[PDB]
């Protein structure tokens, strides 16, 4: 068996778990983008890419067991559900949390705006390259990836252009411009800084905890700070296992997932290597919820929103990433970056039309709203009386006219018949509204 | 001393339609041997040596400097900058080929070309709304009888004296 997981997860622990079950595990770089093009027996990733994989047909639908369904949390099953069928086996629920240094600061900042001042006392930094870490601050003030109405996602509407998203991104670029956070830093640099205690506070998921546990520096985990009185709403990730459609060992991989990995011993061996967070298995989660860090993770998950599993997600991410970079490095303004993300999210646009709209937004930002409206219109456009009967000696026929009074109609028809040389007896039937003239 | 350096020798003079206004020795200006036109109305240039003093700065073309005078009629005097008929103060103008003229033309400076009605003395109009020549509305959109009210000076280095860039400062007391 071949397993692909991210480089920051517990690859070693999964290796021993597979060894107890041969099983081979690898951690290739950029596996979320390598998987669609290459096609590994099973891949562990967040549920957002799994919907796109299922639409492309790369993931084989798994036959579940009702007892197995009852053994795990139901909302995880709903999250890994696409069009009413289950495409993956949930493993863990991971959400971002604020990890601060106890020695550097007694209590975490309650609001985002306090963070600048605190920072200028030290003279906060995290991963800015990936939009997963930046998104909570953008979405704190109403920004949404896709409108969720009556349980369904509206692809036609994208909320990355809301005034809340603009406010969040302009606050973040103000933090960057105040020399408070490095624009070029990534996950690895942020981790290295936090182990050495250079930075007081950071945003990270459960998986990083073990590494900090190796640095033996005291760390406190809590909810992300509120933005303008509104809490940050981080995307909730469901780290799940997807079985490849072309897997020659589909049944073996399914049995390994059901009976060996998703067990108390398997989860406790994996979590020791790297903290998975809120696990999907009920008993281990109950035995682990006593740890305050899992409680903070679950609180952040409750405050935040789970990632959609629609196939229009990955492209979205790319757009947002670009937007964040366009705001992080100062190459272009916040509003322009959000307009570019909105353009890039549109699925039906041809490459030439998309490039044209990108150029039009580049060279004139004064009418950006009208450009976006026309682009959205293009994207939607490319989405795949009284009657007379005369019986004379010469003419026989009929004629209909518009008259309000019967007397007026009979006078008009008398004039018409005289005009046509008809002179004879007249009869009228009001039931059928017919003037019958004959000789 | 009064800051005449900020006024006369400033690198940047605004267009005449948005002429610069500033609030405040004159014999040095009278005999500076650098001033092409220095004409004073209501006062003697040599007897200047006053509670309110205002300096107006703009750049026009050569054959329109005579429009900066009381009682004159013309595009600069009508739709750009009008002086009162009882004006007490005066006008200075000098050639600015070396500074204001750039090879290939200098089209930065502007003047207002259309307006619904003439302008009262001592006021500045900065509005840049579409002018209506006819009766149909423009809705801030050009078209037939819808014209942009501003126009640029083509201050090429090869232009004659009549069309050369003149810098004009008006000292009103």
């Amino acid at each position: 068996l071949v397993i692909w997981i991210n480089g920051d997860k517990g690859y070693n622990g999964l290796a021993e778990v597979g060894k107890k079950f041969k099983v081979t595990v690898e951690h290739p770089d950029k596996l979320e983008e390598k998987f669609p093009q290459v096609a590994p027996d099973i891949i562990f990733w967040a549920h957002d890419r799994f919907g796109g994989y299922a639409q492309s047909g790369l993931l084989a639908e798994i036959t579940p067991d009702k007892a197995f369904q009852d053994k795990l949390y139901p909302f995880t099953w709903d999250a890994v559900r696409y069009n009413g069928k289950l495409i993956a086996y949930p493993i863990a629920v991971e959400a971002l949390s604020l990890i601060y240094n106890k020695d550097l600061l007694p209590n975490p900042p309650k609001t985002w705006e306090e963070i600048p001042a605190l920072d200028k006392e030290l003279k906060l930094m995290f991963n800015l390259q990936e939009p997963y870490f930046t998104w909570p601050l953008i979405a704190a003030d109403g920004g949404y990836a896709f409108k969720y109405e009556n349980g369904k996602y509206d692809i036609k509407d994208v909320g990355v252009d809301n005034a809340g998203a603009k406010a969040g991104l302009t606050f973040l670029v103000d933090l960057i411009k105040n020399k408070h956070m490095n624009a070029d830093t990534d996950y690895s640099i942020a981790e290295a800084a936090f182990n050495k205690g250079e930075t007081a506070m950071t945003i990270n998921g459960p998986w990083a905890w073990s590494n900090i546990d190796t640095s033996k520096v005291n760390y406190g985990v809590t909810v992300l700070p509120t933005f303008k009185g509104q809490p940050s709403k981080p995307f909730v990730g469901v780290l799940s296992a997807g079985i490849n459609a072309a897997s020659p060992n589909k049944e073996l991989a399914k049995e390994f997932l059901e009976n060996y990995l998703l067990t108390d011993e398997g989860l406790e061996a994996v979590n020791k290597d790297k903290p998975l967070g809120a696990v999907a298995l009920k008993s281990y989660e109950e035995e682990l919820a006593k740890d305050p860090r899992i409680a903070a993770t679950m609180e952040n998950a409750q405050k935040g929103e789970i990632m959609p599993n629609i196939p229009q997600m990955s492209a979205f991410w790319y757009a947002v990433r670009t937007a964040v970079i366009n705001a992080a490095s100062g190459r272009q303004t916040v509003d322009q970056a959000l307009a570019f993300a909105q353009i890039l999210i549109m699925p039906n646009l041809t490459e030439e039309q998309r490039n044209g709209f990108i150029q039009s937004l580049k060279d004139d930002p004064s009418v950006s709203k009208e450009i976006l409206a026309e682009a959205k219109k293009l994207n939607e456009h490319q989405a795949p009386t009284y009657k007379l009967v005369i019986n004379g000696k010469t003419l026989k026929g009929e004629t209909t006219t518009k008259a309000v009074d019967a007397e007026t109609a009979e006078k008009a028809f008398k004039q018409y018949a005289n005009d046509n040389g008809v002179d004879g007896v007249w009869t009228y039937d009001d039931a059928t509204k017919t003037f019958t003239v004959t000789e | 001393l009064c800051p005449f350096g900020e006024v006369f020798n400033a690198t940047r003079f605004a267009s005449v339609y948005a002429w610069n206004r500033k609030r405040i020795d004159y014999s040095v200006l009278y005999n500076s041997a650098s001033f092409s036109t220095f004409k004073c109305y209501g006062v003697s240039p040599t007897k200047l040596n006053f509670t309110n003093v205002y300096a107006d700065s703009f750049v026009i073309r050569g054959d329109e400097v005579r429009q900066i005078a009381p009682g004159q009629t013309g595009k600069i005097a009508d739709y750009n900058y009008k002086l009162p008929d009882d004006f007490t103060g005066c006008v200075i103008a000098w050639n600015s080929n070396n500074l204001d003229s750039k090879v290939g033309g200098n089209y930065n400076y502007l003047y207002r070309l259309f307006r619904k009605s003439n302008l009262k003395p001592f006021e500045r109009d900065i509005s840049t709304e579409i002018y209506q020549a006819g009766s149909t509305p423009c809705n801030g959109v050009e078209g037939f009888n819808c014209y942009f009210p501003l126009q640029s000076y083509g201050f090429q280095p090869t232009n004659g004296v009549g069309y050369q860039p003149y810098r004009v400062v008006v000292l009103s007391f």
Partner: nanobody
Amino acid sequence: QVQLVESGGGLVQAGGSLRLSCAASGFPVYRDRMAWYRQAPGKEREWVAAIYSAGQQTRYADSVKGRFTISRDNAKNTVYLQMNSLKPEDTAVYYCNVKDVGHHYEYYDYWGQGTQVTVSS
């Protein structure tokens, strides 16, 4: 002295895009107004877009607001009209235009040769 030469355009399918260029010689592209007009075969020449140096930077006709845009480049002395979501109604000859008065308030409306844009369907 003043010369306006248009380039670009040609034939594009409905919904495509184009970038008309107007190269200007004899005057800097940063001036009072540079505009783009369209003329259809058998209709009257009408105004499409314009870029100014004062007030609102760009103005557009009602029928082409959003789809079109106009920008200027000082380094190459050019005006670019980017046309997106083109429709068969946009089939016309486009001229870049300036208004320069010589000396006597008889402003010579300087036009270019014009480029044909045919938006097929």
